[PDB]
Structures are given as C-alpha cells and as structure tokens.
C-alpha cells in the first residue's frame, strides 16, 4: 500500500505543525484533526490528539510505530461486550 | 400497477420516438437539455393543449415540433410568446432552435389532451364520472377511434380513501401490438392531493 515512488503521505498541516516543533525543540501536544497521515521518523516524542469523531485520544509516538498510519492509535468504534 | 406503457410496448412497430436524432458521446447532454426543454414547456404553458413535443437535431439545429390544441395560447398575438420561448430555448440551445408548431385535428382523439381536460375539469367542481363519460362520448363521436378507456385514480370526490374507477367503450386491446392505442396520463391537482387520469384510445390497427 501507498506506493513507495509516491512516498509517504503526511497532511501538510500536521507537517508544518511538527517541523516547527522540531526546529524550536518544543514538544507541546498537537491538536491535529486528520488521522490518516503516516508517521515518519521525525517526531517520536511529540504527542498527537488525532481522532475527533468523539474523543481527544492523545498518542505519544515512539520508534516502534513509524510508517504506521496515525489512526491505528485512535480506535473509533467501542466494544466492551454484550 | 401491472400494465406497461402502451407506447413502450409498440415503440418500434406502431408508435415512434418523440426525439428523433443520433448521438454517441453527446447523447447524455442531448438528453439533459431535452428533459429540460420538456420540463420548461410543461411548466410554462400547461393551459395550452400540449400533446407531443417531437424533437429533432442535427449538429447545429434543434426542431422542437410541438403539437397543441390551442395555438392561440401557444403563440401570443404577434408570436411574442413563441419568440419568448425561442429565446429561452436558444439559451438552452443545441446552438440554434426552431419551433414550428402543429395543430391537432382531434383533441378528443388525443389521449394526452383528453386526460388534460379531465384533469382540469374534475378538480374545480365536475364529478369524475361526469368528466369520464363526457370524454368517452366526445372520443367515440370522433370517428377515427374504435374504443376508449379512461381511468381516474386517487382521492376522488375529496374522499378519505383512494379509489381507482375506470370507464370504457369499444375495444382497447392493450395486449395487441397492431393497434394504434394512444396513451395519455395526467396528474390533476386537487386540494386533497392529486388524481391520476390515464386514457387509452384504440384508433384502429396499424399498417405494416
């Protein structure tokens, strides 16, 4: 999926939000609405609050989750049982 | 509803197309502006006796041959009405428009017009039975026919319960194909909704 020639997809909003956080070396949480924007090896430490369907869902990125699409960390549905 | 459209049944043997052109890739927008045309002159001059809207077009022209009972209502005094509708069709154009009108010889023998008349007369005051019988009388007195069937369906007489009542005279062989069975339909507007008036007119078999 997401052919390598096209490269990874990261919404420009989250990109301009995170590159400044890098170059100023601050890591306040980012209130980014879109999930879908593949985690790239640029912000392991910064925390995102992606899913806005119904909840805040912070997520601290790590080394272990690069390339994975950010919405995997933000389950939309809810099931506990019967 | 079980009966098919008689026109759709006898579309290539007895009846013919009310749109006479050809297209391959312009077919779509041709159809688009065609239905826009029909909607336009169905909303506008319903008071006139609009029956058929036979359209043709060849790459620079659109003939909009309509068939009417009251050309005096079609065209204004000095054709100002005709010029107005030519103008709005030349807006909604196939790059040029011409609008020769036709006068029907028999509003009583034209199914769509009979249904138009029944629809207008029934809503204001006349009973559906009176209107149906009057239409049938006029049609069968008109000589070309061989039979007629009229069907009014809805809140007849402002009733609380929909009724579908039909009258007839002569022969109406819908299952037969070699039969010029003119079909007409109109939704009479009423304070208690809408009344569907269907008309079938068997004006004799058809030649091969």
């Amino acid at each position: 999926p997401r052919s390598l020639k096209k490269g990874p997809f990261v919404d420009d909003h989250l990109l301009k939000k995170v590159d400044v956080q890098n170059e100023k070396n601050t890591k306040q949480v980012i209130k980014t609405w879109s999930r879908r924007s593949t985690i790239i090896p640029d912000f392991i430490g910064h925390t995102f609050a992606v899913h806005d369907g119904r909840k805040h869902v912070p997520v601290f990125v790590t080394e272990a989750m690069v390339g994975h699409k950010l919405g995997e960390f933000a389950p939309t549905r809810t099931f506990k049982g019967h | 509803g079980q009966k098919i459209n008689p026109h759709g049944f006898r579309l290539g043997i007895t009846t013919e197309w009310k749109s006479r052109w050809y297209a391959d890739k312009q077919y779509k927008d041709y159809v688009k502006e065609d239905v826009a045309i029909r909607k336009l002159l169905a909303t506008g001059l319903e008071r006139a006796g609009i029956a058929d809207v036979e359209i043709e077009r060849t790459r620079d022209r659109v003939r909009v041959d309509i068939h009417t009972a009251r050309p005096g209502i079609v065209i204004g005094r000095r054709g100002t009405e005709a010029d107005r509708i030519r103008a709005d069709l030349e807006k909604l154009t196939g790059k040029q428009v011409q609008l020769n009108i036709l006068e029907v010889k028999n509003p009583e023998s034209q199914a769509q017009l009979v249904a138009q008349g029944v629809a207008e007369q029934l809503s204001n005051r006349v009973a559906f039975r009176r209107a149906m019988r009057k239409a049938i009388q006029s049609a069968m007195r008109q000589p070309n026919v061989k039979g007629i069937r009229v069907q009014c369906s809805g809140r007849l007489g402002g009733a609380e319960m929909s009724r579908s009542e039909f009258y007839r005279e002569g022969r109406v062989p819908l299952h037969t194909l070699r039969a010029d069975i003119d079909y007409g339909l109109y939704e009479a507007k009423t304070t208690f909704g809408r009344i569907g008036v269907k008309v079938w007119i068997y004006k004799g078999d058809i030649v091969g």
Partner: protein, 116 residues
C-alpha cells in the same frame, strides 16, 4: 520440531518434503533445489548426507526457518505492533485484524462457537 534438515522430513519428493518447514513452501523448495544441483523428482529415502549439508548451509545462509522465523513472527506481532495499536487490539481480542466481517463469519479467529 526436532531438526531443520530433518534427515527424513517425510519420504516423498524433495520439492514437497522441504515444505515441511515453517519457512519453506513449494516455490522456495524449487528455487533451493535449482540453486543446488538436486533433482526435485527424488524421494528423501534416496538422499545422501552431503545433500543435506548443502541444503542446511544454503538455508542457514539465505533464508529463515522454524525457530528463528516463528520468533520473528511473534516478536513482530507483540513488539512492532505494541500493547495498544489497532491490529494489536484486535490480535488481543482474537479477531480479524486486516478488515473483515466480524458480524457473521470471523470464526477462524473467534473459535468454533460460543452460542448464547
């Protein structure tokens, strides 16, 4: 289960016998036997020892096999997914990770049945 180069993995052709290994199917068997000089139409009873040695060293140099591969799989699942990813949540709850009807037929993951 006991041997990588099981001296008798099973008495039958080599192309299909080498598939009795957690990292070998039909095409890996074929390409192995092509890279070597071993016929594929030959049973394992007709083997030699040098054949097994070249197979073992080829395999251990080129590709992965039962223990290391199975550990790679399980470590991939746990570590690389995490505690709480989506595919990890659904691995945890025993349900089809890749997108599937859970409504009716997810039985291969859900088990035989738990009718209430």
């Amino acid at each position: 289960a006991r041997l990588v180069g099981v001296d008798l993995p099973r008495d039958k052709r080599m192309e299909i016998a080498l598939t009795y290994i957690y990292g070998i199917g039909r095409t890996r068997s074929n390409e192995i036997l092509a890279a070597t000089g071993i016929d594929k139409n030959m049973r394992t009873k007709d083997l030699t020892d040098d054949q097994v040695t070249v197979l073992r060293d080829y395999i251990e140099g080129n590709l992965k096999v039962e223990g290391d591969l199975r550990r790679e799989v399980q470590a991939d699942i746990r570590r690389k997914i995490e505690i709480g990813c989506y595919q990890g949540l659904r691995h945890r709850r025993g349900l089809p990770v890749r997108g599937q009807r859970t409504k009716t037929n997810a039985r291969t993951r859900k088990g035989p049945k738990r009718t209430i």
